[PDB]
């Protein structure tokens, strides 16, 4: 009558076998809705910051990929002004065994290693390709401004 065994499986593994540097709690009203907090990756311009992300497991999931979006403003070539994430295991390369924790550390991996060269990148991309040094400092600036509380 409830959720597919798989969802229960993962959901329980999360609130049990936590991903390092990533917090993932269930919403108080939607069992397919999760409030995630990702710690800025070590050695990244986001290090020291905490970023809020929301994750939703669609009905037709695992078929359809989970929906994820940043809720904390971040300066990154693959995260837009509304927090939408350009990660391909989220659109093209998605398939059933990936689960949630593949997406999560992958997202953390994106922060650790930006992809300015991505076709659908930002505009932040432009500044990351041409003046990476300045882009990295601005990402740190935005971390100080939006991800320290």
């Amino acid at each position: 009558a409830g959720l597919p065994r798989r969802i229960i499986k993962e959901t329980q593994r999360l609130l049990a076998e936590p991903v390092p540097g990533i917090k993932a709690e269930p919403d108080e009203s939607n069992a397919r809705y999760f409030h995630v907090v990702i710690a800025g990756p070590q050695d990244s311009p986001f290090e020291g910051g905490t970023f809020k992300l929301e994750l939703f497991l669609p009905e037709e999931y695992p078929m359809a990929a989970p929906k994820v979006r940043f809720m904390t403003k971040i300066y990154h070539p693959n995260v837009d002004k509304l927090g939408r994430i350009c990660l391909d295991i989220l659109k093209d390369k998605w398939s059933p065994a990936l689960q949630i924790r593949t997406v999560l550390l992958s997202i953390q991996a994106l922060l650790s290693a930006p992809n300015p060269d991505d076709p659908l990148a930002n505009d932040v991309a432009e500044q990351w390709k041409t003046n990476e040094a300045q882009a990295i400092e601005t990402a740190r600036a935005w971390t100080r401004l939006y991800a320290m509380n």
Binding site: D27, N30, F56, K67, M71, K81, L82, R84
Partner: protein, 140 residues
Amino acid sequence: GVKVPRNFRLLEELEEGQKGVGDGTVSWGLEDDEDMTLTRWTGMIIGPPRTNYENRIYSLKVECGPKYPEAPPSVRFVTKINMNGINNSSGMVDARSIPVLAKWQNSYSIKVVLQELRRLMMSKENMKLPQPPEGQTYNN
């Protein structure tokens, strides 16, 4: 019985707004392109033909609160309009006077609200109302 969270529903409406629907007589988009809360929206309604609203573009502000879409959004015309259900001096849409809002369902959307207002502009009681000069807007 899967429900789609407010933020993801609004993301869907953001995409649909950019793709546009039907004949383009109503349109919507984020008021602030950096508003991660996806709360404030700009609505547009082309006044329907053969009514005193014809050939006029109406801009509106649509506010999707924390409980949207379980709860209806708040709506107000920026463009001045004389229409039943719209406060004549502030542009605020009285939810109780507009069926789609009074009988809100979580299956509704910003699109549906705008299409309903445009349809209501064709009502016998609205189509004949003398309108203020084109181009005027309410304050705030």
